[PDB]
Amino acid sequence: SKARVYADVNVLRPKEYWDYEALTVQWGEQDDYEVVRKVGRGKYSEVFEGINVNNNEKCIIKILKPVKKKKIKREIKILQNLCGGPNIVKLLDIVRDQHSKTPSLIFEYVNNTDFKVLYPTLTDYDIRYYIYELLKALDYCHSQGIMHRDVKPHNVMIDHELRKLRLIDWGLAEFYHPGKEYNVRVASRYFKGPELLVDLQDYDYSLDMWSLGCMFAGMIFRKEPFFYGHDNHDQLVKIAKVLGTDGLNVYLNKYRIELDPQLEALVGRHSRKPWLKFMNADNQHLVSPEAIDFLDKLLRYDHQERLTALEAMTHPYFQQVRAAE
Numbered sequence: 001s002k003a004r005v006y007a008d009v010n011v012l013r014p015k016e017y018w019d020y021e022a023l024t025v026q027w028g029e030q031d032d033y034e035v036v037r038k039v040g041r042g043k044y045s046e047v048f049e050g051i052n053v054n055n056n057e058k059c060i061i062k063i064l065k066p067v068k069k070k071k072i073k074r075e076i077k078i079l080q081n082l083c084g085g086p087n088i089v090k091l092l093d094i095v096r097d098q099h100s101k102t103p104s105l106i107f108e109y110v111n112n113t114d115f116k117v118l119y120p121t122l123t124d125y126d127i128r129y130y131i132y133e134l135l136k137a138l139d140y141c142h143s144q145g146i147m148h149r150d151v152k153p154h155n156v157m158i159d160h161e162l163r164k165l166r167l168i169d170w171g172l173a174e175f176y177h178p179g180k181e182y183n184v185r186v187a188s189r190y191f192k193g194p195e196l197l198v199d200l201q202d203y204d205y206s207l208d209m210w211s212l213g214c215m216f217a218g219m220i221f222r223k224e225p226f227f228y229g230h231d232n233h234d235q236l237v238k239i240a241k242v243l244g245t246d247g248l249n250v251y252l253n254k255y256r257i258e259l260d261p262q263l264e265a266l267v268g269r270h271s272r273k274p275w276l277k278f279m280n281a282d283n284q285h286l287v288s289p290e291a292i293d294f295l296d297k298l299l300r301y302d303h304q305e306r307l308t309a310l311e312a313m314t315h316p317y318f319q320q321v322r323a324a325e
């Protein structure tokens with residue numbers, strides 16, 4: 001398996017672009033940045049709204065929990081590689097505590113409204129608008145040789161006032177190399193693509209388009225997460241209970257993947273639920289034949305059939321959005 005697009009980005013680049021351990025982090029002034037209020041939490045970090053005392057600009061201070069040095073080098077080189085491109089969170093500075101030497105990563109500030117709150121307020125057009133903004137970030141990082149590997153609504157910051165969107169949390173992101181076998185213990189559960197769940201390790205940028213699709217189905221159908229699995233096996237089972245098991249088996253044969261019998265048994269045999277069997281009175285206004293057709297081209301077991309981020313942006317679903325732009 002290889003990526004159908006952008007497969008050669010990192011090979012043509014000088015080795016210094018993707019050799020993230022070759023990076024010597026140039027360090028900044030911890031004082032420059034003061035914690036104002038707590039904004040977020042997660043496994044690998046705590047996140048604070050901050051102030052730059054030099055110039056009084058708001059900022060985001062992301063303080064990392066004790067972390068392997070190599071894993072911080074990767075997140076940092078990715079961010080430096082991607083700073084400036086469409087809808088990518090801009091790294092402002094990287095500072096450390098002097099005594100214990102724990103990193104804080106300084107970002108542009110976004111007056112985010114949490115998705116659990118913001119999403120039910122969104123018009124049909126806003127949904128289209130924001131998926132398109134995210135698609136810009138995705139096509140961009142994919143072109144630059146990076147897979148985000150953790151696309152979810154929590155990782156998509158949205159100032160709704162300024163219609164500003166930033167793809168954040170590049171902690172699970174990774175450079176793409178052809179025939180490189182990756183860890184499938186990436187992404188967040190409900191946004192894990194069939195490939196991660198079935199132990200297909202030579203995956204690529206397409207993984208992000210599954211996650212995108214999950215995130216998109218949850219928005220239009222108002223079922224979030226759309227795929228609610230309890231563990232990694234109940235995730236695949238929830239996918240199969242919708243996408244059908246017939247579609248799975250051809251996919252498993254294509255990449256010659258056998259399932260564990262514990263998995264096979266839990267998965268069983270299921271007919272496909274048509275996408276229109278998620279439309280109810282509540283979400284009715286966010287479904288259209290185009291929303292269905294676009295989503296159907298995202299959520300495919302086969303990562304090679306999946307729309308790329310650049311194809312996805314030309315979908316007639318986004319027509320009105322491209323027209324405004």
Ligand SMILES: O=c1[nH]c2c(Br)c(Br)c(Br)c(Br)c2[nH]1
Nearest residue numbers: 039040047060107110112168
């Ligand atoms: O965990 C988080 N939370 C968060 C927010 Br709320 C913003 Br505005 C920003 Br810009 C960033 Br990088 C993060 N990481």
